[PDB]
Amino acid sequence: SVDDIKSLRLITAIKTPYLPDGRFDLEAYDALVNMQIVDGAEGVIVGGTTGEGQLMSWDEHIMLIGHTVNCFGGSIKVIGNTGSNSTREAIHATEQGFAVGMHAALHINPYYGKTSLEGLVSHFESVLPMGPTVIYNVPSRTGQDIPPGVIHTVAQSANLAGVKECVGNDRIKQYTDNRIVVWSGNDDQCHDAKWDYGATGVISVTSNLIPGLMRQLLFKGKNPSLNAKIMPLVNWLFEEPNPIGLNTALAQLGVVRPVFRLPYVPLPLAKRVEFVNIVKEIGRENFVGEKDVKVLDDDDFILVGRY
Amino acid sequence: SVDDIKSLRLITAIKTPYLPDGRFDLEAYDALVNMQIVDGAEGVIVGGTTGEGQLMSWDEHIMLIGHTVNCFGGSIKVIGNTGSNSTREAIHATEQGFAVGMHAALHINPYYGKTSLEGLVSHFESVLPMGPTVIYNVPSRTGQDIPPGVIHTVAQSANLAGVKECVGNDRIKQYTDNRIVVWSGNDDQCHDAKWDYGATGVISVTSNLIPGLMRQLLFKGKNPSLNAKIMPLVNWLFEEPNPIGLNTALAQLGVVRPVFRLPYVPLPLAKRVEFVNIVKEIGRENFVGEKDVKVLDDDDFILVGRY
Ligand SMILES: N[C@@H](CCCC[NH3+])C(=O)O
Ligand SMILES: N[C@@H](CCCC[NH3+])C(=O)O
């Protein structure tokens, strides 16, 4: 059960698509999950950073984790992002998530409302007993680097599957040398993480677009060449904060509606044209969907604040 | 009125005290507010960072604002923290906060779920029309520095009261030379901010403990001696992230119960022993409360995760 998570090499942090009024577009979401499955993704993160979980009510969130489990749980591992900057919120979400059948939880350290190292331990130890758990470190978002010390302290739990690491390949290695399963959370770094730094795989953004190529990158030996060729795409996705790019790109491919929940807004026209070129360089047949890529007009995009 | 907010020199980011089970201690809260009033604080932030708004549910938060307004609104300015990383949350909370009678809103940029500069503008422009607003920049917590460009863009709203700035004094001056009201959000920098860098005042943590001395620091001219005197307290208070220090200090003074909402945990015995001596050197009479400062035993502290 923890071992079943520990073996996953490709996890997609799935985007969450919306209807024109802001509510979840379940029909679109299901088609994305399907496409991920068809191309070899072994797990999904539901409502991750990429999934705009930060923009969900707990409501929506648990419902989505549950829908995903009920429709797709036999085919793919479901990792609910039930983390919080608040311990109470995390305990309660995690327990509801596991109750609706999720396979694991993703847990970030408390963002914004930063705690002490002792506090991190208390926080993690309060949810770790609930099930298989992946700890999320991303200091550029949270304002706090989880030190390896904390990680080893909590790794005394049998329920810890591993870390989602964003600090770099060098940290990934501090961990993988010391009996700790790591997935890279940086797409631009993940090839080398896997083949040179001991990472088990990726929890990927880029997977939402090119799941087959992402799997290729991780399953079949070193391939710096394939790595180099997807890199222009990766750079585009991260120019602005994720998931601004992915949301824009999924709309251009026609697999989601051009609807954004604020505070996210689409990439400008110049970027979108650029996307079309990036797509043709790589080959459209490698991206999700069947439809011809569009540039889209600014007026196509809907921004929702009240939903 | 925004001009009423712009003239405030001393704002306290008031702490939120708890009952043994984790619920708000309103009796202790009212008493902290009164203490502030008696020493001449001109405004409070209800559920700011220091107030652990991050650990509140929305019903709690709004209730606390509405309560503060009802009980103390004629005698102190009430600024609700109705900020959020989610635009939706911010819209609903802000409108509800203004409807119950708050004087201004405190708005942070979206933490953790980072957006673009264009997203930033859209986010702030959703709430700005609602009433007087203080914008909150603390990139050490949020992962993102609000660039002055953004602030100038939003400053087209007449409802912009000013900025709570935590980046430093140089940034402040950049705003103050350019027609923008600023309050320093750092206590170790607030004296010099006000007298040398054009800051209108402080939004203070330390005023929770020593309100009179902070008023003196900001009202009665340059005083390098008093500033040097409070400085050991200010250092102690920020050694671990705020408000771990404050929480433990107020409990040592006996004005709150030694109850923590997770993920915060108290400072350890040696640091508590050290607070006792800092109190001695400044004089307990400048501190809030009437009780003898205690060290407290570890067994005294109550950590709550489900509340
Ligand atoms: N916007 C809040 C609540 C999100 C809760 C659902 N995941 C936060 O990021 O903490
Ligand atoms: N922990 C959540 C909920 C905040 C509740 C209202 N102050 C957040 O920081 O966004």
UniProtKB/TrEMBL annotation, chains A, B:
GO terms for molecular function: 4-hydroxy-tetrahydrodipicolinate synthase activity. It catalyses: L-aspartate 4-semialdehyde + pyruvate = (2S,4S)-4-hydroxy-2,3,4,5-tetrahydrodipicolinate + H2O + H(+). The keyword Disulfide bond does not apply. Keywords: Amino-acid biosynthesis, Diaminopimelate biosynthesis, Lyase, Lysine biosynthesis, Schiff base. Its EC number is 4.3.3.7. Belongs to the DapA family. This is 4-hydroxy-tetrahydrodipicolinate synthase.
